[PDB]
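tmp note - NADPH-dependent alpha-keto amide reductase
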Amino acid sequence: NQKFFTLSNGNKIPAVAVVGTGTKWAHAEETDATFSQELTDIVKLSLDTVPGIVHIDAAEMYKTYPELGAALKETKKPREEIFITDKFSSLHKISEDPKSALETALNKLGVDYVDLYLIHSPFFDKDLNIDLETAWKQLEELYKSGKAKNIGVSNFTVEDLKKVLAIAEIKPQVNQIEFSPFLQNQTPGIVEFSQKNDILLEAYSPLGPLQKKPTDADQQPFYQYLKELSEKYNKTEAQVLLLWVYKRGILPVTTSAKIERIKQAQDIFSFDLTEEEVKKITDLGLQHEPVRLWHVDFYTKYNSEAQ
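out:
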């Protein structure tokens, strides 16, 4: 049965996000502003066939509202069975501000609200004429109006979260960070801070370790153990790592080209890990050097405290 996290405002969010719109397949020199049929196809197929509430992770910066919008319009899936995360692009300016960005998004996607809206980065584009405080206040208004059922941030440090909390009427409910066995603190102390302050973490790129296993993986304790757990529960290595993220109290955000892996991702709650197992993945993971896929130019300086 499907599991949910409860945010600080009492609302429920599916405890895994199985469909992402950040990744696509386009046969052209210039894949930007090429519509990807294959993306819209896998999104639609996922909405139509994956059981339970389907949690989709979208963002203004991905430039794939058209693909997403086509799927939402044609899907047989009821709106109440879809949880849509969307994100204002603060790192690279595309709209003036959040209020406009969401409006533009709602129109393209043909829905009347998103379930979760995030500020995508604390590193605001120099070209914006809004700062974090004002961007947040706009999210609080999108929240009060009901156009964002829930609001939050992404890739924020402790210091960035503290800035929001100092001016917030509505406390940010979510902080989506990169998190994996090989990156257990994107920035210093973020996980402990967030989880003590009732801010749900989402983990982007949790399957970093599985992107390409080194050749000598079978000599490495981490991968050996992951295979052992895979065989014990009769589940994929991916499923084990996604469930571990959940057991850490964090919401894994994953994506795949293959409907099989999307279904598998949704089905992680068909088994459980022991506390010993959870501890051991954590510990074995921490022995690896950090692997960072996102916000690399900004947060490479924090790699020393990431593991």
